[PDB]
Each structure stands twice: as C-alpha cells, then as structure tokens.
C-alpha cells in the first residue's frame, strides 16, 4: 500500500519526569515555543515536571511526517 | 563619658574605607559590661577554654 | 619612607569581593546559557 494520504497515528507518549536543579535548565526549557506555562512567572528552580503528551502525526511518505502534534 | 573624648578602654568599628574608628555604642556597651562586672562579678559557667 | 598608590581608585568600590564575584558569575551564566540553548536548537533542526 502506498496511499499514505489515507493513513494517520495517535500514540500516548511515556511519562517523562524532569527534575530542575539550575537556571540553565529553566533557560533551556524556556526557548522551547512549546513549552507553555498557565503562570509565566512560575518559579520552576527545585521543582520536578513531569509530562504526559501525546503524538498525532499524518504521514506524506513512508519515512516523512506530513504533519506532527504534540500536546 | 565626656563628648568629644576618647575612654581609655573603647571598642572599634570598620567604616567602609576599611579603617577602624572609635564607636561610641559599642565602647558603651563594653564599659557597661565592665562596670556591671565590677559590681556583680561575672559568671563563666559552661565556657570551654 | 615613601608609599606610593597604584591602586587605580579600586579602594573606593565597596564590597570589592562581591562585586567581582557577581559579574563573574554573569558572564559564566551568560556564556553556559547562549551554549546550551544554541545546541538544544540545533538537536531540535536536526530531528525535524
């Protein structure tokens, strides 16, 4: 089969848990776009996140994405 | 203790120039204490020497 | 006896252990921050 048009995925991710020691962490995870806080002022240092995303993605070909959501 | 007078057993204190200077406050408190050590005595106990 | 003082001013900067210690810490943030960040970027363009 090569009607990729057709075809779609969902995976639930694994938990990830991250644990903040330094502000360069903090830097690090702030750069990221997706990487959104309700409280932009959230005082992250010494804290442990964890994140629980899932993934749906649209393909264009066998081994390229035509489209990834991460949420 | 006279103004503009210096006791003879005074205390010091660093300015932020870093030189140490006559205080008054804290050579009252030393005279203070010397002058109550004298009418009551002082006690050392538990002091490890 | 003669002294001479070559201290450049340095005598009036109050705090002199503090202050040095604070902007060397800046640069050293600064410079581990930009580092991080530009290679965090390049993974994330490499992967996409």
């Given at each position: 089969?090569?009607?990729?048009?057709?075809?779609?995925?969902?995976?639930?991710?694994?938990?990830?848990?991250?644990?903040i020691?330094?502000?360069?962490?903090?830097?690090?995870?702030?750069?990221?776009?997706?990487?959104?806080?309700?409280?932009?002022?959230?005082?992250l240092?010494n804290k442990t996140?964890?994140?629980?995303?899932?993934?749906?993605?649209?393909?264009?070909?066998?081994?390229?994405?035509?489209?990834?959501?991460?949420? | 203790?006279?103004?503009?007078?210096?006791?003879?057993?005074?205390?010091?204190?660093?300015?932020?120039?870093?030189?140490?200077?006559?205080?008054?406050?804290?050579?009252?408190?030393?005279?203070?204490?010397?002058?109550?050590?004298?009418?009551?005595?002082?006690?050392?106990?538990?002091?490890?020497? | 006896?003669?002294?001479?003082?070559?201290?450049?001013?340095?005598?009036?900067?109050?705090?002199?252990?503090?202050?040095?210690?604070?902007?060397?810490?800046?640069?050293?943030?600064?410079?581990?921050?930009?580092?991080?960040?530009?290679?965090?970027?390049?993974?994330?363009?490499?992967?996409?």
């Amino acid at each position: 089969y090569t009607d990729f048009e057709n075809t779609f995925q969902k995976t639930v991710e694994p938990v990830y848990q991250m644990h903040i020691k330094t502000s360069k962490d903090i830097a690090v995870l702030r750069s990221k776009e997706w990487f959104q806080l309700d409280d932009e002022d959230f005082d992250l240092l010494n804290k442990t996140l964890t994140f629980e995303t899932e993934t749906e993605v649209t393909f264009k070909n066998a081994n390229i994405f035509s489209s990834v959501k991460c949420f | 203790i006279p103004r503009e007078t210096i006791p003879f057993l005074h205390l010091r204190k660093k300015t932020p120039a870093g030189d140490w200077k006559y205080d008054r406050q804290l050579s009252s408190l030393f005279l203070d204490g010397l002058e109550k050590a004298a009418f009551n005595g002082v006690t050392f106990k538990d002091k490890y020497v | 006896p003669v002294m001479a003082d070559l201290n450049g001013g340095l005598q009036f900067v109050p705090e002199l252990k503090e202050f040095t210690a604070k902007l060397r810490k800046e640069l050293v943030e600064t410079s581990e921050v930009r580092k991080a960040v530009s290679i965090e970027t390049a993974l994330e363009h490499k992967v996409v």
